[PDB]
Amino acid sequence: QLVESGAEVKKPGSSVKVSCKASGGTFNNYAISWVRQAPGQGLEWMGGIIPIFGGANYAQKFQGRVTITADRSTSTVYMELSGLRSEDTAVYYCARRPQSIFDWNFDLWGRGTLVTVSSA
Amino acid sequence: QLVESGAEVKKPGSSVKVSCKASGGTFNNYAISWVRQAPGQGLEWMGGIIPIFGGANYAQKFQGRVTITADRSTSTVYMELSGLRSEDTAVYYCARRPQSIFDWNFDLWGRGTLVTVSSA
Amino acid sequence: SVALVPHVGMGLETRTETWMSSEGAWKHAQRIETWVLRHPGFTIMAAILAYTIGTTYFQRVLIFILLTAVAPSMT
Amino acid sequence: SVALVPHVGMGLETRTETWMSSEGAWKHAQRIETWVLRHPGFTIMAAILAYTIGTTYFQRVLIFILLTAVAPSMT
Amino acid sequence: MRCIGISNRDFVEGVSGGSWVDIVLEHGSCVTTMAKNKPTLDFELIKTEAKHPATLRKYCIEAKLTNTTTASRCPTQGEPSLNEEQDKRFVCKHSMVDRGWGNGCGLFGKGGIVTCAMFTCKKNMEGKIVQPENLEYTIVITPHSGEENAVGQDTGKHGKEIKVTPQSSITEAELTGYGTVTMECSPRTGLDFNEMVLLQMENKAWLVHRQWFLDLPLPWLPGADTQGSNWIQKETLVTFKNPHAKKQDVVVLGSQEGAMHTALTGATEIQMSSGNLLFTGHLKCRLRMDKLQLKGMSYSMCTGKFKVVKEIAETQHGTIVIRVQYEGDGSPCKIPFEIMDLEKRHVLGRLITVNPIVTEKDSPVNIEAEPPFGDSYIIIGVEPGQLKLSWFKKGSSIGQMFETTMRGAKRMAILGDTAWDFGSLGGVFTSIGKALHQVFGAIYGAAFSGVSWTMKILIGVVITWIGMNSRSTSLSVSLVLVGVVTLYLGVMVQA
Amino acid sequence: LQMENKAWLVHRQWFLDLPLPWLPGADTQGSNWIQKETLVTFKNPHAKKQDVVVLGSQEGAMHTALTGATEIQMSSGNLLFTGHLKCRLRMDKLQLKGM
Amino acid sequence: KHPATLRKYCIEAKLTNTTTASRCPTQGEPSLNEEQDKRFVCKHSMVDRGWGNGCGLFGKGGIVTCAMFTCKKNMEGKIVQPENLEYTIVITPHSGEEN
C-alpha cells in the first residue's frame, strides 16, 4: 500500500528527493514517517507528516536539512535531504502510523530506497 | 466550388437522394437548382431552393415526387426522388444561380450524378 | 456568478436584436412568478407587511411588488 | 439561467457547511454595492422617489432600500 | 480521544426512570452521555448511506447542435414546413424574414421562416431518489474509559460501530466490560428523503430539494427514458437569432456546469461516486442504559504511586485530559481521583471519565475531568504518594451559562422541534415545548420558504420596528419577539 | 468580447467588472490570474479536512451574462453588423440620367 | 482593425498540485511556499486538533491549502482604436435598371 521511488546515486553536496505513494486509504487516516538506516547501523527516525494536515515534524538531528511534503492531489509523500555526504549513504524507509501522538506503530513499511553518495 | 455526390445505381420503385456540397459563399448568397438530363434527351428543370431561406419550389411535373433540402451545418443541398422508375433514369446536375426571382443564369455547375435505374 | 450581471442597462442598444433578447425579456418575470407559486407563504407575509407599513393604497402595492420581487432575486 | 435559482431557502440545511456558503453569503450584497457605485444616477432618482412616495421616514427608507435592491436584481 | 478534540461535542447528563435518554446524533458532532453509576459513552454518527437509488430526472448541461436546416414560405402563403419538425430531437423555431423579388418570392412582405437543428446531449446532471427504507446509518459507540485502541486490529475490542436501518428499530451494541448498549433510533424521520434528490453532476453530488430539482430550467429526460434523445425543454439551452429579420440561425448555449454549480449554492455536497454516502444530517436515537455496566466496578482502589506522563491539556469543552500511569501493585485497580479546592475541603470537580481504572501496570490511562472555574487541585492517588496538581480554569460561570444558552439556540436553529428531544427524558415540559415548536416552525417555514438570509434579516427588522411602534403591549411584545427570532435565524442561517 | 467561436460588443466597464479570473492581456505565459478565488471553492466540511475544487465551465453563465450585448463577428476580422453612421450627403454634382 | 487585448478572463480552469499546511493550536497561522506563488490559489481555515489528530494541545489549529490554478478556456476582451474603424456604405442610383 506504500510504494517508494527507485534507488538513486547522488553526489556529496547534492540533494535527493524520495517519494511514497499512499493508496488513498493511508492518506487522510494515518501519518507517514521517514526512517533511514546507514549500512551497518541501526534505524534512525528522520521525521513524519500527516498528509491530510500537512505539518511535518523532524528529528533534531535532521532538522534544517530534511523536508517532508505531501501532494494531496496525488496521494504521495516526499522526503528531501539536502547537503548529502558519504555518511548519508543509507536505505530510506517510509512507514504509516496512526495520527495519534502516543501511537507510533509502523505496521506498513516502504520497501526502502537506497541512496548512494559516491562517484562510481 | 460546387461538388456533387458520387454515382448511384438504383432499382425501380425506390427513392434516391443526391448530394450537392457548395461553398460558404455560394450557400449564403446564391440559389441552387436541380436539372436532370435523361439519356439522349434535353435538359429538364426539377426544382431549386435558396439554401439560406430553404423554401423549395419544384416543377409541376415533380410535385410529390422530388424533395430538395439544404444542410446549413454542412453547407450541402440534397435532392430526393421518390417512385424511381425506368423513365427516371438520367444524369442530375446542381447549378448555382442568384436568388432573385428573375435571373436564372447558371454560372456554376457540378459534374452530374448518374442515377442508373438498371442492373449491372 | 457571472450570470447575475447580464449587461442589460448598458445603453449602446442598436436596432439589431441583441443576444438572447427574446428569452431575457421575460425570464426574470417568469422566475418571480414561479417563486410566488412555489412559496405562497412568504407572499402572504409580504402582503400583510406592505399593508401594515403602507399608509396609502399606492404605497401598499408598491411595497408589495418590491418585496415580492426582491424575495426570489435576493438570492 | 440555472444560476438565478439557487438552493438557498430550501430548509434542508444541517450543521455541515453548504456548497458555497462562505462565497455566496455576501455575493448578493457585494453585487448590489458594486451596482450602486457604478450607477449613482439611479440611486439619486430612487432616493427622490422614495422620499416623495414615502409618507414617513420608515416608508421612505424601506422603499429606497427595496428599489436599490431590485434594480440590480432584475438586470 | 475521537470525541475529545471535536468542537461540536455535547454532554448529556442523566437518564429517565426507565434509564433511557434520547439523543440527536449529527454528522460532525459527537455526544458524550453520562449518568450516575453508568459508564460515560461517546456517540458519533459517522456514515449515512442511501441504497438502491432510482433515477428521477436527467438534466442536460452541455449539448451540441447539428443538422441545422431552414425552410420558408413567403408572405401571405402560410408557414414553412420542415420534415425535421416531425422529429422531437430537433429544436425548431418560427420567425419572419423580409422577402421580395430579390430574396426569391413574388410578394413584398414578411415571409415565414422556421429553423430546425438536431439537439444532442454531451454532459448529464442525473438526479436520483432513494426510499427511506434503504437508509442505513452507521454509529460508532466508544466507552469513554481513558483507554483507547490504536487504529488497526481493534476488531470491536474497544469502540463498536452499529448499523441503524429502518428495518430494525432496536440496535444492540455489546461493549466488552460494559455490558450491552441498546440504541433505538428513528431513521425514517431524520431526513425526509422523499422530498430529497441525490443530484450527481460529473463526480460531484448534492442533496437538493425535490421541488427545486424539478424546477430547474434545463433540458431533461424523464428518468424512465432509455433512448436518451427526446430531450424536452431544449429551448433553455439553444438560442435562435434573427438579427435584422433577414436570416434565421441557431446556436447552442454554453456548458451549464458553472451556472449549475452557482445554482447549487445552499445545498450540502454529498458523495455519490460509489455508494451514495451522506455525511450530513442528524439521527434521533433513544439510548437504553439498562444493561450498561461500569467496567472498573468490583475493583480495589489503587494504593500505589501515580505519575502524570503527559501534561494536563485543556480541551475546547471546558474539561481537562490527564494522562497518568500507575507504578504500584494490584494492577487491575481503580484510580483515586479528586478535584478539590485550594483548602482540600470540598470536592469541586466531576469526572467525565467516570470510574477511571488501571488495567495494566505500565499502560497510560488518560482521564477527562471537568474542573471548577478558578483554582482547584487535581489529586491523584492515595496519601503516601498522592499527586497534588494545581489547575486554573479561565472562564466564569455566567459566561458558561451564556455559552450553553447560545449553543441551545443554535441547536434549535439547525434542528427544529427535534432539538427538544436532544437530551430529553420524557417530561411534560419537553413535550409541550416540542408541540409549540412544531406549530411555530410550521408557520415560520411557511412564511420564510425560499428566502435568503438578507431577506430574513430585512423582514425581521421590519417586523421588530412594527412591534416597537405598536400601541398594544401584547402585539408589540409578540412582534418584537418574532422579529428578534427572525433576525437571529437570518444571522445563523446559510451555513 | 470573443468567446470560443462567438463574439459580442460589450461595455468596457461591464467587461472590467466581470467576476472571473483575468490576465492583463500582455501576458504570454498566463500563470498570473487575478481573481482565482472566483473560479474555485474551498470547502471545510465540519472542521476536519480542508479541500478545494474548481467551479466548472463558465461558458453558459457567461452567455447568460451576455444578454443585451449585440453579437458581432471576430473570426475573419472584426466585423460589426450593428450600429449607425451619421453622414452628410452632397447632391450638388448629382444629376438625373437621360433628362 | 488591429484590435488590442486588455483581459483574458478564464471561463474554465483546473487544479493540479493541492498542498496543505497546518499549525497546532495556539501556534499561529501556518504558511506554505506556494502561498507566495501567483499561479496558486490558497485559503486559510481552522481544523479541530488534539491528541488523536497529532497536535497535542486540543484546540483549533490554523490550516492553509493551496492548489495550482490552470486555465483551460478563456474569453479575450479585445479593444480597437476609434481611428481603426472602417464603415462600408453602398450607394445605388435606384433606377429601373437591373442591378
Ligand SMILES: *[C@@H]1O[C@H](CO)[C@@H](O)[C@H](O)[C@H]1NC(C)=O
Ligand atoms: C445529419 O447529417 C448527417 C451528415 O452530416 C447525416 O448522416 C445524418 O443522417 C443527419 N441526420 C438527420 C436526422 O437528418
Ligand SMILES: *[C@@H]1O[C@H](CO)[C@@H](O)[C@H](O)[C@H]1NC(C)=O
Ligand atoms: C506539480 O507536481 C508535479 C509532480 O509531478 C511537479 O512536476 C510540478 O512541478 C508541480 N507543479 C507546481 C509545483 O506548480
